[PDB]
Design a binder for these strands. Structure first.
Lengths: 115, 116
DNA sequence: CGGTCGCCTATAGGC
DNA sequence: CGGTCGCCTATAGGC
């Protein structure tokens, strides 16, 4: 549910977008001790409290460290933000956002934690 | 479920292909008295009795008259015949073959008459 | 593969 | 559209 604290520009001024049972916040993990992988990938779709104004927030890196990030603004174009979000999730999990109740991790890609 | 009599080349030598609940024989109708439409379109996928050899049979025209037709042969390629068949049905009904239990006629397109 | 970019191909649609 | 065509573009995916 919460805006990711590291999103300094929007924590306070915004909330994670929801609609029914869809909630656009996800945390991905890939751990593989053989090749030295202990990394996260976080994605959020953010509506401002101020107006109907949108943005997608992505942050990634080694567990522990605060990593690097990307904020992508979408003005009032909810459809765009949803695409960007869904597409990113897909690139990193090889599952669709829509089929996440039946999530199945794939070798070589990130796994998902439930919220 | 019969080979269409007008298919002279294959009536006697062949039968309508079936596969589970799928039976590849369909009759389409478009009647619209306002624009003067009283036309059928018949499609059949035919397996020979002789061997595993395939063909799609299409006949169409004004109700009453025997119209024109097209026989398309597919040798042993069942998959091809099924595509040709399904694709034609789609062009003329704007429904998929797969979803025909829940068929919904579309304005401007053919309707499907449900067999026996 | 964190980011991002961009051929080629195979279709699907407009005309 | 009842048959057939074939350009050109826009689009989506694989690599």
């Amino acid at each position: 549910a919460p805006v990711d604290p590291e999103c300094t520009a929007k924590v306070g001024k915004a909330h994670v977008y929801c609609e029914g049972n869809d909630v656009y916040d996800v945390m991905l993990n890939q751990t593989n001790l053989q090749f030295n992988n202990n990394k996260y990938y976080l994605i959020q779709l953010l509506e401002d409290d101020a107006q109907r104004n949108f943005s997608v927030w992505m942050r990634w890196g080694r567990v522990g460290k605060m990593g690097q990030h990307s904020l992508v603004a979408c003005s009032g174009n909810l459809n765009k933000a949803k695409e960007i979000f869904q597409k990113k999730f897909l690139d990193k999990t090889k599952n669709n956002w829509e089929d996440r109740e039946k999530f199945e991790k794939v070798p070589g890609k990130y796994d998902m934690l439930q919220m």
